Amino acid sequence: GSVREEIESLVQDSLMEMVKGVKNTIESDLASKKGLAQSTTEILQLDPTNKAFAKSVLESPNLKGSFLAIGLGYESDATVVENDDGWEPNADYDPRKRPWYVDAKRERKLVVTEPYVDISTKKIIISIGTPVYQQSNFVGAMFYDVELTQLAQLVNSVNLFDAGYLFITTKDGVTIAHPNAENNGEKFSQFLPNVDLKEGTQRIELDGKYYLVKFAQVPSESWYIGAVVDESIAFA
């Protein structure tokens, strides 16, 4: 009777502690990626039209090792410098048309894109985009690609194993990271039907098993971190 509610207290408190820990992990990874992007862009702005300098920066190992891919597209001749070993842009690739470029140019600051199809890996990715200025003139934009399987591994750092999993969506419920990447770029409702996108805990039924969904928001980009938990397994 009162133990039921005591147990419920323990369960909800531990879910929220688990999710906030994961939320801090995501915030920390994002902030450090943004800081790197911001500094790299500022450094390239010392001589932005110097393609040889730009390539050298993007090929430097720590930076190259921090993102799936990095590149700079130019507003003038639609050319692109990038550090993707296994990709060279087609004759009809135009960076100015790409969402990282459009977002960065529109907002005139560092942006994180919505999920979109990568030209190189043909997968859903997200990118950090930044504008590049030559003494107050916009001369192009940069992308810093983020691999989403890696992001999914990160939110599932804590290992819920067979008890459940964590995922990430945008503010509009579009999936950013999930153990099955096939969900990425789609509305999260396709693997969690009739679940509202809001902070807090929801209890749902399928079969005659109960599941707990906990959402928490990442303020910087308004992402939602979600956890799905099998009660029977997680609290046996």
Residues 102 and 163: their CA atoms lie apart, in Å, by 41
Residue span binding its own copies (CB under 8 A) among the ranges 33-41, 90-98, 117-125, 204-212 = 33-41
* Residues 65 to 124 in contact with its own copies, rule: CB under 8 A: 66
CB 151 within 8 A of CB 92: no
Which of residues 45 and 120 has its CB atom nearest to its own copies in the complex?
45
Contacting Ca ion (CB under 5 A), which of 84, 103, 118, 147?
84
Site string for its own copies, 40-69 (x = CB under 8 A): x-xx-xx------x--xx--xxxx--x---
Phi/psi at 106 (5° precision): -60, -45
Indicate whether 25 belongs to the interface with its own copies (CB under 8 A).
yes
Q: Minimum CB separation from its own copies for residue 35, in Å?
A: 6
The set of long-range contacts for 125-128, using a CB threshold of 8 Å and a minimum separation of 24, is 125/68, 126/151, 126/176, 127/99, 127/100, 128/33, 128/34, 128/37, 128/67, 128/100
Give the tokens for residue 106.
């529109």
Which of residues 62 and 135 has its CB atom nearest to its own copies in the complex?
62
Residues 166 and 80: their CA atoms lie apart, in Å, by 36
Indicate whether 147 belongs to the interface with Ca ion (CB under 5 A).
no
What are the beta bridge partners of residue 116? 125
From the list its own copies, Ca ion, none, which binds 63 (C-beta under 5 to 8 Å, kind-based)?
its own copies
What are the beta bridge partners of residue 228? 165, 213
Q: Minimum CB separation from Ca ion for residue 111, in Å?
A: 23
Q: What are the residues binding its own copies (CB under 8 A)?
A: 17, 21, 24-25, 28, 31-32, 35-36, 38-40, 42-43, 45-46, 53, 56-57, 60-63, 66
